[PDB]
Amino acid sequence: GSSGSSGPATDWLSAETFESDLDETRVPEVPSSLHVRPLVTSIVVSWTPPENQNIVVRGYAIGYGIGSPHAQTIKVDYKQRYYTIENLDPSSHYVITLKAFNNVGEGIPLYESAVTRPHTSGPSSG
Numbered sequence: 001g002s003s004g005s006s007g008p009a010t011d012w013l014s015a016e017t018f019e020s021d022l023d024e025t026r027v028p029e030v031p032s033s034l035h036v037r038p039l040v041t042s043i044v045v046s047w048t049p050p051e052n053q054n055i056v057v058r059g060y061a062i063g064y065g066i067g068s069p070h071a072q073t074i075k076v077d078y079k080q081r082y083y084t085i086e087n088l089d090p091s092s093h094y095v096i097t098l099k100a101f102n103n104v105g106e107g108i109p110l111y112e113s114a115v116t117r118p119h120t121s122g123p124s125s126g
Contacts, residue, residue: 024056028100030108031060036096038114040123041089045114046082047098058102063109069097090119 032051037044045062057078064085065071076083088094094116099109117123 022056023052023054024102024104026055027105027107028055028057028102030110031098031100034096034098034110034112036112036114038094038116039084039088040117040119041086043085043088043094043096043114043116044082045085045096045098047110048081049078050100056102056104057100061097061099061101061106061109063097063099064094066092066094069095069109088116090116092116 028050030050032048034045034047037046043064045064047060049057059075059078060080062074062076062083062085063069063072064074066089074083074085092115094114096112096114097109098112100107118126120126
């Protein structure tokens with residue numbers, strides 16, 4: 001062998017020091033609220049964090065699907081404030097849900113409604 005080897009690393013980041021003080025002993029209950037904007041062939045799902053900015057929130061879950069959100073689910077990072085679900089089906093009521101989950105566990109999901117606009121090969125003049 002030749003003086004073995006190693007792997008140095010160093011860099012700066014923008015975030016707190018994972019303070020243990022933060023409330024991480026319980027799960028993040030339902031968020032402040034959840035807004036959804038139905039689009040022709042898309043849907044801008046905009047949500048908001050819980051008033052309490054002390055609970056450690058790893059990420060949230062976005063469930064969508066006609067009849068029930070269980071159909072499909074999308075997971076993202078906390079930073080993410082809203083998700084634009086593209087390649088969807090117009091003229092259809094999509095049930096979007098949102099639930100806060102952390103290392104402690106999952107919370108209570110929300111119930112919303114978003115009716116995509118009628119494509120009609122040209123929603124103009126409507």
